[PDB]
Amino acid sequence: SSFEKVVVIDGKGHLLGRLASIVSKQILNGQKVVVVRCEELNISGEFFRNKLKYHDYLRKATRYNKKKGPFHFRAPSRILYKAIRGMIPHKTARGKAALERLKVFEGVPPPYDKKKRVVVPQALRVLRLKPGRKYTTVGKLSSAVGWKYESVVEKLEEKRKVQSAEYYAKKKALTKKLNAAKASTAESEAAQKLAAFGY
Amino acid sequence: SHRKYEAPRHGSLGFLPRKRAAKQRGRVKSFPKDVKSKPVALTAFLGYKAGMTTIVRDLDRPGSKMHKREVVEAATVVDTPPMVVVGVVGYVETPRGLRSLTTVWAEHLSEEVRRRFYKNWYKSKKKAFTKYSGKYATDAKQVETELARIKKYASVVRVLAHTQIKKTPLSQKKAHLAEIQINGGSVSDKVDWAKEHFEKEVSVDSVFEQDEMIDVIAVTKGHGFEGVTHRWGTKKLPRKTHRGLRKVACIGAWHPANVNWTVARAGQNGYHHRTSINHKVYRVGKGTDEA
Amino acid sequence: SSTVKAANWRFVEVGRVVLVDNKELATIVEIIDQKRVLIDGPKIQRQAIALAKIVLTPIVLPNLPRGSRTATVTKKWAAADIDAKWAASGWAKKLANKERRSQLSDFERFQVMVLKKQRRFATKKALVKA
Amino acid sequence: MKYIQTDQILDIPEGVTVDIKARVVKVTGPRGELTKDLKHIDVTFNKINNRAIKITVHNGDRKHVAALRTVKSLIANLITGVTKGYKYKMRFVYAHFPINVNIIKKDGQDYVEIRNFLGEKRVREVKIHEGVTMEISSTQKDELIVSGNSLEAVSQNAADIQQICRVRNKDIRKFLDGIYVSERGTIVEE
Amino acid sequence: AESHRLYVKGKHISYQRSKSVTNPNVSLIQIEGVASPKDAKFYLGKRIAYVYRAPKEIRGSKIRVIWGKVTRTHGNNGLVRANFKKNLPPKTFGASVRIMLYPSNI
Amino acid sequence: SRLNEYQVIGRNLPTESVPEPKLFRMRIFAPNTVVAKSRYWYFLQKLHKVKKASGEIVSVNIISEAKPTKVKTFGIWLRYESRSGIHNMYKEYRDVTRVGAVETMYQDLAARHRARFRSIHILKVVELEKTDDVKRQYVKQFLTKDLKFPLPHRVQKSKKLFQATAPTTFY
RNA sequence: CAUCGGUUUGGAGCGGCAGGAUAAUGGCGGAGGAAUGUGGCACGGCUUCUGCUGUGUGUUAUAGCCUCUGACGAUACUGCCA
RNA sequence: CGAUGAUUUUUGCCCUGCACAUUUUAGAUGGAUACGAAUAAGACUUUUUAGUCGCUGGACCAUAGCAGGCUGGCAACGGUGCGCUUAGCGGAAAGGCUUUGUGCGCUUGCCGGCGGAUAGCAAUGUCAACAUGCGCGGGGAUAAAUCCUUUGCAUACGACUUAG
C-alpha cells in the first residue's frame, strides 16, 4: 500500500492480464513500475490455444499499406506491454506520462539485478488458477511466433542466478553470525525489557 | 467482380521497396554460421568487377546430352588485390542483438584507408588516428587491455580489412573498408589471428578455392526514374489509348479507398542491393602469373 | 527401503483445533460437506461454518466423538488442556506479541528505541570479537 | 461429483526400491534404474510399508480421479521394467519382395535400416532410443526383437518401425506387406 | 533526526466523476496505509495541503499551497473525498498531497 | 434467497350456508411474510376453489429449526419446469437447518438446470433419520466412519498489493 | 478556534423496554432407543500387542449419540424509547 | 541503439575542485531492504521415522541532540560519516558491489553543564536531485563539414560515387 519510489515486480509465475490490470492502475496513479523476467509470465489456457490467438492477432494488418498496420511485437516484454497499453488511455498526455512510468524487461538486467523484487498475490498463477488447469509461458509463445533471443536470455539468466546464489551464500553466512551475537547478548537488562514491550 | 482471366502478378513483393541502396558498397547481411572445429579463416573478400568474358569447358554431368562435350559459357572477372587487415571488432550477445563492444586498430594505417575518413582530404590536416597511433607508446598496454576485453567478453570477432585500390586501374583513391567475420576456433584464437595479421595482406587464395560456390553482394546497375512498363514488366496498353499507353490501367478498386502497396507504380529502378548465390569459381588467378 | 516423501497436511477431522476470526479457539465436532463443518468451543457459540472462514491449527483434541454436544466438548477440552497447548506455540506467541506491540504508547515506543540502541551496541561488540 | 477421496495400492516386489520425492518417481531394481516425472498430476504418495505404497487423490472430479489409475499403471510398468524387462517380437510380412533389415551404426548412432520394402529403392532408417536393444533373432525367420527396461521406449521404437513401413496408393487390404508387432512380453519369461 | 515529517502522504487520484462527466469540485485522495473506510474515517476533517512550486517569487518564496480538507470517505478501499478552496488542477492527477494531522481529535 | 419456513393457515370466507369452513395449513419457504402469504394463495388456487378475495388468512407463524446445531440429511421432492416440460426430481442435502437445505436447493437447481425460483414447487422436505434412507452418493460419501480429508492448496487472501516474499500454499 | 441554528452522513457505538412456540437452542434432571457401536469379549494381519488394526457381538462400561419431557436461565431476530 | 576516429591558435574548446546565482520538474520529504525453485510443497534437528517453523511487511534496518548547537567526564577499541588509499569482482543497459590501510571527525553505550522564548494560538513557513550560466583554481588538446570546380560506378532537381 505504501508509496514506493520504484516497485520492481518479478514477472515469474504471474498471469498476464491480471498483472497488467494491477500495473496499469498503479502507473496511472503515479507509481513507477519495473517488471522483470517478462519471459516467465503465464497465460491461462493451453499453449496451442494462445498460439492460435496470436496468429489471429497477426492476421490483422492495414490492407493498403502493411507498414501502417498494427505492429505485432514478438518479445515477451512487448506482449506484456501491449496488454498493459490496452488498459491505459494512451492517446492522452496523461496516458503518455503514465506509460513513461513503466519499464518491462526480459530477464533481470542491471541495475535491477541487485534490487528487491516483489510479487503480486492477486495475479499469481499458482494462487489464481484451479490446480488442474493448463497454462502457457509467454517465452515459449514468443519463440513460437518469432522471438529470436530465448537462448541468449536463458544463458544470461543462468549466469545471473549463479552470481545471485553466491551473494545469497555470503548473506546467509553473515546473518548467521549476527544471530549468534544477538543470542549471546540476550537475557540482559536491555534484552529483558525489550521482551516486555513485544520486541 | 473477379478477373475474367487469371494471371500471375508482375514483379516480386519480396524485393520492396525498390529504392536506392543506402551505400554503394554492398554489406553482408549474414555471415556463414561459426563452427569451432574448423581452422580460423576469413569468410568474405572484396574485389572489383572487371568485366565479362567467355570460356570453353568440357561438361562433366552424367546423363546429360552435353556430357563430355564442350560448352561455351559466360564468365565474370573480379579483380581482387589482397586485402589489408587493420582492425578487430568484438561483438557481445545481448537480448537486443549483437552489440559491438571494442574496436582495436593497427598501429599504422596506409594513406588510402585514412582517406576513407575524410570528405575533403586535400584541405585537411590529416589528423586521423594520430593520437591513436601515439597510444602505441613503447608498451601498447591499452591495446592489450582492449584485446583482453575482446577475448573475455566477445562472442563474435570480425576483422576490419580494406582493399588496396591503388593496385587497380580505378581513379578513386579512397580504399573500401569492411567488416569480415572470422570463423573457426575459439574467440581467443580468432583474436590472436587478427592481431597477428595487422597490417598484413590476405589474398583470395586463402579465402576461396577453385570450384567453390560463393555468393556475390553488390549494388546493381542504376537506371534512374522508370515507368511501370519497364520497372515491373506490365503489359502495354493498346495503340489507340488516350494520354499514352505505358501505364497500368487500373491502380485499384473503389474500396479500399486508397492505393494498395502491391500495385505497380513508376519510381527508381536499379541500383538496388542484391545478394546472388551459387556462383561457381572457375579460376583463381595470380597477378604474378604471366599466363 | 522405499523412502516416500509424505505430505504434512493438516486434516479436517473431528477434534481439530481451529482459529475463528483469528481471535477464538474452537474445535470441529462434525463434518457437513467438503466446504462446511460444525464447530464448538468454550468461548465460541456452537455453529455451522465454512472452512474458508476458519484456520486449522496443528493441534488435535484426542478422542472426541462425532457430533459431541457442548458439555462433552467443554469437558474434554479442559481435560486435554487445549488452551495451554495453543498458547505454547510460536503462532500464538507471535499473535500475542502483535497485540502487545499494538498497545504501545509514544513514550514506551521511545523507550523501545533506546533499549534497541543499547542492545545493538552490545551485539556489535560481541560480534566483532567472535 | 467431487469424490471425497480415491486410493490405489502399488505393490512393490522384493528386489525393488521405489523412491518418490516431489512427484519424481525413481524405481531401482536388478535390471537397472528408471525415473519418471509426474509433475502434471496432483497426486500424493504414502508409504504403507516396504511392499505397499498408497496413491491418493483428494476431492477430485471425474477426470482428476481418472488420472489416478494411469499413474498407478505407469509406476507399475516402471517396476516391472527393472525386474523382468520388456520384449517386443515383430514379424516381417511380405508377399513378393523380401524385406532386408539391418542393424547399422552411422555417426556413432545405431539405426534400423529397412531395404527393398515393396521393391522401393528408398531406404528407411529408424533412430534407436537409448536403453533399447534391437536384435535380429536366430530362433525364427523374418523377426525383430526390441528389448529394454522402459516399456514406453520399447513400444515407441516398435511403433516407429511399424509406421515407417506403411503402404501408399494401394489397397492395404490386399497389399498387407509390412513389419508388425506380433508379441508383447517380458525378457524373463513367466 | 533523519525524519521530520508530521503529515501523512497522500495522492491526488481523480475528480469525482461518472463514466463521461467529471466534477472538479470534489477530489479523490488516496491516503497512504489506509485500505478500509473504517481507517479512512480517522482522517475526516483533517486538512490537506497541495504544495507545489511556481515560476515567480512571492515574498521571496517559490512555493505555493492550496489548502483543503477531508470531507467523507469514498468507496470501500479507503479513498476519501477532499474539498479544496480552489480545485486541484487536472495536471496533479498522481501528484502527492500532505494530510496534516490537525485539527487533532486524539 | 435468504429464506424462512412459515406456517400459513387460511380458510374460505364464512358463508351463511357454510359457517365453519375447513382450515388449511401449508409450510412455505419465503424471505418474508408478504411473500409467504402470497405463496400460500398460489398453492391453494392450484388445489382448491378459493381466491384471496374470497378467502382469509388465519395465521402466519415462523417455524424455527428444532435442533439448529445438529447435522442432518434432508430429502427434498421437487416439481420444476424446464424450457420444454415439467419434471419431478428428488435431491438430498446435508445441512443443520431445514431452511438452509432449501436455500441450497434453490442455488443447486439454478446452477444445474437454470431453474428460477418461480419455476420450482417444493413437494416435501423430509429429514432422513436412517442411513439407508440416503440414495444419492454425493451425500452418502460424508456419512462414512472416521472421515478425514486435507485441504490442499490453501490460498491466503493478501491485504497488500505487493508481497516481498514468495507465495506458499501449505496447509 | 469556540459555541449556536438549519441540513445531512456516520460509530466495532452504549443502555432500557416489548413481542415470538412468553423464540427455538444450550446447560441441568428424568425416561426410552439406536448405530457410522465406546469399553469389554471372540476371532485375525502387521506390530517386543507402540492413537496397533480389521471383522463380529452388543446398548455405556475406560467414549458418547439420538428422541420425548420438567423446572429454570439466556441469546438471535423484529420493533419502540418525546 | 552501439563502437571508433578527429574535434577550431580560437580567446574559443574538454576534464576536474570549487563558489555563487538561476530555469525546470507527470511531482524526494528515513531506506527501491538483491538467492533459486516448488506449490499434491519448502526449511531445520535428529533421524529419513518423527518433531518444529509459516497461518502475511502492524516485518527488517534505521530512528533521541539550535533541520539537530557549545562544551566536560565514565566505559569499550566498537559503530558510523567524510577524505584519501589497496585489491578484487561485475559487459544484458557493466557505471555498481565489495575491499586494505590511514587521517580527521561524530557517537544516544552511560553521565553531566550551558543555549533555544517574541515566528506571539496555525499560515508549506521555504532545508532535496537533476540541469544551466557565470566567477575563479588546477589540468589538456589545437578540427572539420558545406558551397565551388571535377567525375559518371549516379542522376528529373536534390541526393550519390570520385578528385581537387
Write out the residues of chain A at the interface with chain B, using a CB-CB cutoff of 8 A: 63-67, 106-107, 109, 149, 152-153, 155-156
Strands A6-10 and A32-36: parallel
- The Cα of C115 is separated from the nearest Cα of chain A by a number of Å equal to 5
* Virtual torsion, Cα B253, B254, B258, B262, nearest 10 deg: -10
Resolution for this experimental structure (Å): 2.6
As a whole number of angstroms, the distance between CA F16 and CA F13 comes to 10
Method for structure elucidation: cryo-EM
Q: How far is the CA of C101 from the C1' of H58 (A)?
A: 8
Could you check whether the bond before residue B256 is cis, i.e. omega within 30 degrees of 0? Answer: yes
Peptide bond into E55 cis (omega under 30): no
Q: In this complex, is the C-beta atom of C48 within 8 Å of any C-beta atom belonging to chain F?
A: yes
Contact positions of strand H to protein Cβ (< 7 A): 1-7, 23-43, 48-60, 62-65, 67-68, 76-79, 90-97, 108-110, 123-128, 142-147, 153-156, 160-164
CA B46 – CA B196 distance, rounded (Å): 21
Cell of C94: 507471535
Give CA–CA dist D103/D112, Å, rounded: 5
Amino acid at D167: V
CA dihedral A43, A44, A46, A49 (to 10 degrees): -80
Neighbours of F54 (CB within 10 A): 10
Q: Is the dihedral of CA A30, A31, A35, A41 positive or negative?
A: negative
Work out the number of other CB atoms within 10 angstroms of the CB of residue F61: 12
Measure Cα distances from F19 to A85, F11, F14, F48, F53 in Å.
79, 11, 5, 18, 17
CA terminus-to-terminus distance, chain B: 67
Query: Which strands make up the sheet holding F24-30, listed edge to edge?
Result: F24-30, F4-12, F55-62
* A55 contacts A41 by C-beta, under 8 angstroms: no
Min Cα–Cα distance to chain B from A158, Å: 14
Question: Cβ separation of F141 and D59 shorter than 8 Å?
Answer: no
| Cβ pair B95:A67 closer than 8 A | no
A139-166 burial, b if ≥16 CB within 10 A, otherwise e?
bbbbbbbebebbebbeebbeebeeeeee
Q: What share of chain A is helix, strand, coil (3-state, %, to 5)?
A: 55, 10, 35
From chain C, which residues contact A within 8 Å (Cβ)? 97-98, 100-101, 104, 108, 111-112, 115-116, 118-119, 122-124, 126-127, 130
Report long-range pairs for D19-22 (Cβ below 8 Å, ≥24 apart).
Answer: D19/C2, D19/C3, D19/C4, D20/C2, D20/C4, D20/C5, D20/D45, D20/D53, D21/C3, D21/C4, D21/C5, D22/C5
Measured distance CA(B134)–CA(B144) in Å, rounded? 14
Bridge partners (DSSP) listed for residue F10: F24, F57
Residue F138 touches partner D, C-beta closer than 8 Å: yes
**Residue B137: burial class (beta carbons within 10 Å; 0-12, 13-18, 19+):** exposed
DSSP per-residue string spanning chain F: ---EEEEEEEEEPP-SSSSSPPPEEEEEEESSHHHHHHHHHHHHTTTSS--STTEEEEEEEE---SSTTS-EEEEEEEEEE-SS-EEEEEEEEEESSHHHHHHHHHHHHHHHH---GGGEEEEEEEE--SGGG---HHHHTTSSTT--EE--S--PPPSSS-BSS------
On whether the CB atoms of residues B157 and B91 are closer than 8 A, the answer is yes
In degrees and rounded to multiples of 5, residue F136 shows phi and psi of -95, 135
Closest CA to D61 of F145, F148, A131: A131
Residue B223's nearest CA partner among B86, B20, B1 is B20
Q: How far is CA F130 from the centre of its chain?
A: 21
CA–C1' C113–H80 (A): 18
**Of the candidates F112, F8, F4, the residue with the CA atom closest to the CA atom of residue F58:** F8
Q: In degrees rounded to 5, what are phi and psi of residue C87? A: -65, -15
Phi and psi based region of residue F114 (left: phi greater than 0; alpha: psi -120 to 50; beta: remaining):
left
Closest by Cβ to F166, choosing from A22, A26, A119: A119
DSSP state of B43: -
Grid coordinates of A14:
504471474
E34 touches chain A (CB under 8 A): yes
Paired sense of beta strands E96-100 and F4-12, if any: unpaired
Give the pairing type, strands A32-36 and A102-104: parallel
Q: What are phi and psi of E8, to 5 degrees?
A: -100, 135
